[PDB]
Amino acid sequence: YFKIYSKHTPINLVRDLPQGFSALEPLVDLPIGINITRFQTLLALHRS
Amino acid sequence: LTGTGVLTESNKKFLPFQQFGRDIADTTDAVRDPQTLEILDITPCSFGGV
Ligand SMILES: *[C@@H]1O[C@H](CO)[C@@H](O)[C@H](O)[C@H]1NC(C)=O
Ligand SMILES: *[C@@H]1O[C@H](CO)[C@@H](O)[C@H](O)[C@H]1NC(C)=O
């Protein structure tokens, strides 16, 4: 099971992670049962 | 979740994922019911020595 936990906290600190506490509630559990050893982030492009 | 006890209304702020919150002795203390998604207390039926 691939579980996802999440939290969205309003911050304004410029660069690093904030100094404080914030708990991440579970969001959805995925009954997938696959072999995972790698992951990759997805981004977007900008053409003007 | 078989068990015997008196059900009441609960003010325990069960977050959406939380359903069947326990106590120290790992026995259920407050359960969120099926078919209604409403939160109830479980305090045991009154007992004591004689
Ligand atoms: C997942 O793949 C790796 C090879 O990259 C292998 O060594 C491992 O046994 C696999 N695990 C499962 C659960 O299939
Ligand atoms: C049936 O159960 C669902 C929760 O799975 C609930 O949202 C719904 O209100 C229930 N309907 C009736 C008629 O009890």
Token pair of A12, please? 């304004």
Distance CA B38, CA B50 (A): 37
List CB contacts (< 8 A) between B17 and chain A.
Answer: 25-26
> How is residue A14 annotated by DSSP?
S
Experimental technique for the deposited model:
cryo-EM
Q: Give, for ligand 1, the residue of A2, A34, A35, A39 to mutate: max count of ligand atoms closer than 8 Å to Cβ.
A: A35
Using an 8 Å Cβ cutoff, are A27 and B16 in contact? no
Rounded-to-10 torsion of CA B13, A8, A21, A2: 80
Mind telling me how many Å the CA of A43 is from chain B's nearest CA? 30
Using an 8 Å Cβ cutoff, are A7 and A23 in contact? yes
- What is the three-class DSSP state of A16? coil
- Which residue's CA is the closest to the ligand 2 atom numbered 4? B35
Q: Resolution of the experimental model in angstroms, please?
A: 2.2
Q: Give the CA angle between residues A6, B26, A30 to the nearest 5°.
A: 30
List CB contacts (< 8 A) between A26 and chain B.
Answer: 17
CA A36 to chain centre: 17
Paired residues of A28 in beta bridges? A4
